[PDB]
């Protein structure tokens, strides 16, 4: 609920998280993780078949 402050370790600044929402609850912060469904397509979909 409070942002990092100038002078904090750069590693903390990069990984600090802000307001929790249903859309980000229990998610990671890599780019792409916070958009669309929680689970990656690659852990639920199958593939084109022979």
Is residue 50 a contact residue for a second copy (CB under 8 A)? Answer: yes
For residue 13, what is the DSSP state? H
Binding of residue 6 to a second copy (CB under 8 A) = yes
d(C-alpha 3, C-alpha 38), whole Å: 25
When asked if residue 46 is in the footprint of a second copy (CB under 8 A), the reply is no
Would you say the C-alpha torsion 30, 32, 36, 38 has a positive or negative sign? negative
Shortest Cβ 47–a second copy spacing (Å)? 11
Q: Does 17 bind a second copy (CB under 8 A)?
A: no
State the Cα–Cα distance between residues 15 and 12, nearest whole angstrom. Answer: 5
Binding region for a second copy (CB under 8 A): 3-7, 13-14, 49-50
């Amino acid at each position: 609920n409070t942002p990092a402050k100038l002078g904090d370790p750069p590693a903390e600044i990069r990984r600090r998280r802000g307001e929790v929402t249903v859309g980000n609850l229990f998610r990671g912060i890599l780019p792409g993780s916070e958009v669309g469904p929680y689970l990656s397509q690659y852990i639920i979909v199958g593939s084109k078949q022979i």
